[PDB]
Structure formats: structure tokens, C-alpha cells
Design a protein around this motif. Sequence first.
Motif, PDB file in Angstrom:
ATOM      1  N   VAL A  15       0.833  -1.201   0.000  1.00  0.00           N
ATOM      2  CA  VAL A  15       0.000   0.000   0.000  1.00  0.00           C
ATOM      3  C   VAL A  15       0.867   1.251   0.000  1.00  0.00           C
ATOM      4  O   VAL A  15       0.613   2.198  -0.755  1.00  0.00           O
ATOM      5  N   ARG A  16       1.926   1.258   0.816  1.00  0.00           N
ATOM      6  CA  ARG A  16       2.828   2.405   0.867  1.00  0.00           C
ATOM      7  C   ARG A  16       3.555   2.608  -0.454  1.00  0.00           C
ATOM      8  O   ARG A  16       3.713   3.747  -0.908  1.00  0.00           O
ATOM      9  N   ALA A  19       1.029   3.949  -3.027  1.00  0.00           N
ATOM     10  CA  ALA A  19       0.636   5.313  -2.698  1.00  0.00           C
ATOM     11  C   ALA A  19       1.759   6.303  -2.980  1.00  0.00           C
ATOM     12  O   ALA A  19       1.507   7.397  -3.494  1.00  0.00           O
ATOM     13  N   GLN A  20       3.004   5.939  -2.651  1.00  0.00           N
ATOM     14  CA  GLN A  20       4.135   6.820  -2.932  1.00  0.00           C
ATOM     15  C   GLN A  20       4.345   6.990  -4.429  1.00  0.00           C
ATOM     16  O   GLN A  20       4.589   8.108  -4.904  1.00  0.00           O
ATOM     17  N   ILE A  23       1.502   9.364  -5.606  1.00  0.00           N
ATOM     18  CA  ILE A  23       1.549  10.758  -5.161  1.00  0.00           C
ATOM     19  C   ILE A  23       2.863  11.446  -5.484  1.00  0.00           C
ATOM     20  O   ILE A  23       2.997  12.651  -5.218  1.00  0.00           O
ATOM     21  N   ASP A  28      -3.883  12.494  -5.790  1.00  0.00           N
ATOM     22  CA  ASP A  28      -4.365  11.772  -4.620  1.00  0.00           C
ATOM     23  C   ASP A  28      -4.803  10.363  -4.998  1.00  0.00           C
ATOM     24  O   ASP A  28      -5.511  10.162  -5.988  1.00  0.00           O
ATOM     25  N   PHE A  29      -4.393   9.388  -4.191  1.00  0.00           N
ATOM     26  CA  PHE A  29      -4.657   7.992  -4.501  1.00  0.00           C
ATOM     27  C   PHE A  29      -6.077   7.597  -4.100  1.00  0.00           C
ATOM     28  O   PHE A  29      -6.845   8.385  -3.541  1.00  0.00           O
TER      29      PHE A  29
END
Lengths: 60, 48, 49, 166
Positions: A15-16, A19-20, A23, A28-29
Motif C-alpha cells: 500500500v505504501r 501510494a508513494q 503521489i 491523490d490515490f
Amino acid sequence: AFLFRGMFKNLLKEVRIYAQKFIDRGKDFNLELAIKTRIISDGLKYSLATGNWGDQKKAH
Amino acid sequence: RNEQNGAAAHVIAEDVKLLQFHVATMVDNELPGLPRAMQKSGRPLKSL
Amino acid sequence: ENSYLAGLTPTEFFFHAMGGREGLIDTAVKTAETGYIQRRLIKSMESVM
Amino acid sequence: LDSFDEFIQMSVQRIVEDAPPIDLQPPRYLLKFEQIYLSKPTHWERDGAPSPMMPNEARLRNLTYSAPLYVDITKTVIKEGEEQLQTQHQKTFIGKIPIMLRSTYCLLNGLTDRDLCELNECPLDPGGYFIINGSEKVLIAQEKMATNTVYVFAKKDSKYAYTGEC
DNA sequence: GAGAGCGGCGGAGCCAGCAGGGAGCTGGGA
RNA sequence: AGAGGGAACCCACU
DNA sequence: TCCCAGCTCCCTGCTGGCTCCGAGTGGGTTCTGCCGCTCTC
């Protein structure tokens, strides 16, 4: 619980990473595409089915 | 190909180092202190 | 102090199980070592004629 | 049964809440997991309609007797504007947990013998196993040395005369 | 755009090897 | 008209 | 001419590395990459 700790850790890591990557361009995810249920589901299924008590990459 | 182009003289050292690993591991996979040859699914190769 | 006919008393049963486990363990253990010794002896003296 | 029930009731929630919150930024993004929800075991067909799945049907069709897991996630966004907007995604599906049979989260829980026979299940079957791809799997307890206690040993050829470990 | 194909991501017991420690010869000075 | 593979792991027999 | 201090050389002792670990046999199971991105119809 020993499996679920590491599997939740892998879910958070994926997830990280997603998301990184999303973004870094400034947008925005969305949460549902960030979470992949395949890790938890298939990992628990594999560890119960095969008896190799760990990750798929380390059978030995 | 990299010998014809000339490369940067350290990619050649890197590729020969990786060629050394590939040739020797075909003969023997059980070298201590080295990573085991890996194709698939956590199962090491069977050398000669 | 009891025979098998009179019946082993549960402490005696447990101690007898503890005794028999040693024999089962020894029977399980000694086979690999004896087989290795036999193989080594035969490979040493196989061609003496 | 008690080990699996304690796992589902406490350990999953404790592992979820124990994990650190996700901080990731240029704009400050915070992710927090609050509460887990585990539903009854169910099967989604190719149409996608959910239906309850019996253990006998799981055995016959080579399925996995599992239940979906939903978690509540709160997402607070900070775009350097000095205020934060919080968004909650309630009941976010995160995976499937296989269910031990005849536990408190099985569909056979608390049923009478007539109900078990109507569901084509043996009343004398003790349960306590998992159905993974139609095959019944049992988890065997593993012995390990106890933790948080001081033990003193002595080795034969080691350089240490006496060693204490914890 | 759908279909798709390939590009990339434990224990036990012999040898080698080094390290420390004396004989022994050699240049310098008695 | 001779099909038709393999590795790993577990259980069991003497 | 000869007596010492310094350099040379061989043995001894110790540590780390490598190879081995009974013979057969009958069942069962899971697994045989995957995400992706340019490419083609």
C-alpha cells in the motif's frame, strides 16, 4: 497470528509503495486500488495447503 | 556486444563476474558463501 | 512389586512405559550407524580374493 | 476450537491496531486502521452475488471454507492549508481468512443433530480442521522453549563454563 | 480497445593456514 | 495401435 | 682473530572449512511466475 503479522506487514508495504508511486506525480490515490487482498488470501491458503510455514519464496 | 562497443571498462568486469557465477554454478550449485542459482519458486537448480 | 497377572500401581505402569521407551529408542537409533559401518567395511574389502 | 476462537476474537484486532500508522508525503497523508469485521463464510459466484457456503459444498466443489475480512480505515489529508479533511472507508475488504470448522464463526455453530443431518454433516464429527481447496487440513501444535524465563545450562566443549539465557 | 507475447523482477572428524617461538648463521666492533 | 512428465513435502509398512 | 646482536628458517600449535550420516516399499498432497507494457487485429 505469526503468519498474519507478516502478511499485514506486506500489505502495508505494498500500500505504501503504490501510494508513494501515485503521489510522486502529485495526485491523490484511492484506497481500494491500493489494497491487494491477494497477498493475505493466497498466502494463508498456501501456508495452510502446503504445510510450508512461511513465505512462498522461502520453502527451505 | 559490449566488447565491440568497448563499454566503460567496469561493466565488462561486472559481466565477467556474473559470467563467472553462471558458468561455475552449472558445474556446482553447492558453493559456500555464494548465492544459490534460482530459476523459480524457491527451488534451487540441480547442477552437474 | 506386581506381576503382569496381578497388573502393574499406575506409577508402576508409568515407570514401565519409561523403561520400554529406552528400548524402542535404541532400536530406532542403532540402524543407521550399523548400516554405515557395514557399507564402509564392504567398500574397503570388496575386491580381496 | 478455543485457540482459533481467541485468535479471531483478539489477535487479529491486536495485530491490526498494533501496526504503526502510515505517514507518507509532498502533502501529509495519514492512514489509520481502527476496527476489524469478520463476516460469516460465503462464496461469490461468477455473477458476483454472495451466498452462504456450506462445508459439504466446499468439500465437493474443491473450494476454500473462508470468510471475508473488513477493516475500517480513516484517511486524513493535509495539503499545507492548515486544516485537515478526514475520510473514513468503512468495511474495506482486505482478504479472506479460512475458518476452523465448528468454531464460533462457522455456519455449523450451535446447531442441533437434526440440523446437522439436514446439512449432510455428521453429528459426531468433532470439527477443528480447515477445508483448503476441498482437502481437510489440521494444524499440529508445535513445542517450543518457554520465553521470558531464565535458564542455566552447561555445554561440554564450549569455552563458557556456565551460561544463562533468557 | 481487446487480445497477447515476451521483457523484467546439527554434530563429528581429517586438511589448509597462519602465528608464535627457538636454532643458527652473519656483519659489526672488542 | 506401446502410450504417459518431473520435483518437493507429509503419512505409513518391515 | 673473534665475540654479540640481529636476521633467517623450520617446527609446533591452533583455527576454520568440508564431507558424511541403513536398506527396501505403499499411499497422499501442492506446484509447475507474474505484473506489465509495448505490440498486434
